[PDB]
């Protein structure tokens, strides 16, 4: 299977430079072009450029010609995209895509790059214990509160990905303090609260922090 | 985006056919391969159509693409709620020497059943209270249409400060999700008898209350 794995989300200061990596697997690295596409929050797709992994030829779009530099490492089947003179307006999700079938047939997961003068901040995870009066028949709601982190994003899984039924990770809210907070809740059978173990796995790549918080019955 | 012109939105009742046109010129569409891309809410873009009419594996046959002259068209038969997403037209422009995407076209299915919101309110955790903080978490989910208003009350009086509410967000099952947070100090939490989260949706209100006890 063709897979394109990108580097994690990061905070960058204005004027700095960042290099996003894209490791290619499942296909011959030197047989296909590689594209880069950026998408600002709530905006459309913007093509950035294309690289030929065999000889290293690059061609960038007009908007990004003065600040983007794309390289590649054939030994590791990895394409790099460097954005210099970073600015607040560069905050976006950056994708690599394989240039098969004369289009962009396989995409990476995307890398959310935030440009800000504020520093990164790890999250504070608190349990949301399932209450008794808040239950709904045979189902109960329990979750984790991920408070006061910067920047986005954070990924929440339950039982290391072994629990996906009923899981709902809500979008984050931007507080007046400039920090984000969100909640992830899984609907669980109300009778298996005492037997089943419920762990929320919170990952904040920009701070290089992972928290596995255990949610107990109240 | 400017060289490729897409409609901002297309709509059709469930089970009907929708059509998205992508208009360009001889420099891009009239002479180069056209591809279409689908972006489900909260997901990365994926290839829907390549080489103007070919479907990769995993794409339902309800999706169809074609090209005529300097325009390309994406067709979706039997429109289901799972097709609601942003659709992008893409091709190569020989004048610019660049790959170009059209502006997003949002597909919306009309006549969707009304969903009354489900409200779940969490009191501050003991861990947070031991950490000199307190936050009330009100979670609203499975509502349609996606317009909710949240009101908070200390006992029976409104609270305006410390209230942060998200914009309604599209869930994966379509429908909608929202969350509202009320930030308190541990003093104000234990000092009151009850705190309330009221959610108004389509002229009807669902209210849940929690108490320090």
């Amino acid at each position: 299977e063709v897979q394109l794995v990108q580097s994690g989300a990061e905070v960058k200061k204005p004027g700095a430079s960042l290099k996003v990596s894209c490791k290619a697997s499942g296909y011959t690295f030197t047989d296909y072009y590689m594209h880069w596409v950026r998408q600002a929050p709530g905006q459309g797709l913007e093509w950035m450029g294309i690289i030929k992994p065999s000889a290293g030829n690059t061609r960038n779009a007009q908007k990004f010609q003065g600040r983007v530099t794309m390289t590649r490492d054939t030994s590791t089947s990895t394409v790099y995209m460097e954005l210099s003179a970073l600015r607040f307006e560069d905050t976006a999700v950056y994708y690599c895509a394989r240039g098969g079938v004369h289009g962009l047939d396989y995409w990476g997961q995307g890398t959310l790059v935030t440009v800000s003068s504020a520093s990164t901040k790890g999250p504070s995870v608190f349990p949301l214990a399932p209450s008794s009066k808040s239950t709904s028949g045979g189902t109960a709601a329990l979750g984790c509160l991920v408070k006061d982190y910067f920047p986005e994003p954070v990924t929440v899984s339950w039982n290391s990905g072994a629990l996906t039924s009923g899981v709902h990770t809500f979008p984050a809210v931007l507080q007046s303090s400039g920090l984000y907070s969100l909640s992830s809740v899984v609907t669980v059978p109300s009778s298996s609260l005492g037997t089943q173990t419920y762990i929320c796995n919170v990952n904040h790549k920009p701070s290089n922090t992972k928290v596995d918080k255990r949610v107990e019955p109240k | 985006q400017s060289v490729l012109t897409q409609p901002p939105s297309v709509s059709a009742p469930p089970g009907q056919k929708v059509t998205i046109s992508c208009s360009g010129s001889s420099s891009n569409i009239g002479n180069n391969y056209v591809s279409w891309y689908q972006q489900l809410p909260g997901t990365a873009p994926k290839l829907l159509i390549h080489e103007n009419n070919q479907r990769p594996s995993g794409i339902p046959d309800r999706f169809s693409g074609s090209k005529s002259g300097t325009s390309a068209t994406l067709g979706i038969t039997g429109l289901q709620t799972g097709d609601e997403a942003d659709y992008y037209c893409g091709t190569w422009d020989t004048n610019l020497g660049a790959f170009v995407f059209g502006a997003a076209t949002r597909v919306t299915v009309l006549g969707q059943p009304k969903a009354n919101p489900s409200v779940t309110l969490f009191p501050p955790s003991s861990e947070e209270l031991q950490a000199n903080k307190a936050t009330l978490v009100c979670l609203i989910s499975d509502f349609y249409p996606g317009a909710v208003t949240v009101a908070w009350k200390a006992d029976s009086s409104p609270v305006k400060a410390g209230v942060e509410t998200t914009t309604p967000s599209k869930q994966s099952n379509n429908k909608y999700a929202a969350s509202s947070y009320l930030s308190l100090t541990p003093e104000q939490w234990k000092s009151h008898r009850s705190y309330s989260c009221q959610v108004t949706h389509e002229g009807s209100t669902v209210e849940k209350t929690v108490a320090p006890t």
Binding site: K52 | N31, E51, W92, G97
Partner: peptide, 14 residues
């Protein structure tokens, strides 16, 4: 150069 652009024009041409 324009050679790479000409390569891409040839590739994407339908």
């Amino acid at each position: 150069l324009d050679s790479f652009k000409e390569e891409l024009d040839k590739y994407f041409k339908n």
